[PDB]
């Protein structure tokens, strides 16, 4: 069979494929990280320090 071949085991063409693929991955990481979570919105809205005052009398 064709895919049963030692030439296709260390094929430099697929290595170029992998190289270009992961270089492009590296180039686009800062866009994959650009998703917003709404957890600090929750922290801002719900974190309420104690607003009661001290009154000895």
């Amino acid at each position: 069979l064709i895919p049963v071949s030692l030439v296709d085991l260390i094929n430099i063409n697929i290595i170029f494929y992998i190289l270009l693929l992961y270089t492009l991955l590296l180039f686009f990481i800062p866009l994959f990280l650009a998703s917003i979570n709404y957890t600090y919105h929750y922290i801002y809205k719900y974190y309420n320090y104690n607003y009661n005052f001290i009154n000895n009398n």
């Binding site: 309420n48 607003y51 005052f53 009154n55």
Partner: protein, 56 residues
């Protein structure tokens, strides 16, 4: 609703501007400020009474 039927009617009209609904927003800032007001008025009455006592 009709005899032997139920249906869902949807209008067909362009929405030129958004539809507003008054959903009041809960916030503690007004009550914070009103508490500050009340405590300050307490202290002000206290100072006035103490001045009246010390001077009269």
């Amino acid at each position: 609703l009709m005899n032997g039927l139920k249906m869902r009617m949807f209008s067909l009209a362009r929405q030129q501007a958004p539809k507003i609904v008054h959903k009041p927003v809960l916030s503690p800032i007004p009550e914070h400020l009103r508490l500050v007001k009340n405590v300050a008025q307490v202290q002000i009455d206290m100072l006035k009474l103490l001045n009246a006592q010390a001077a009269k």
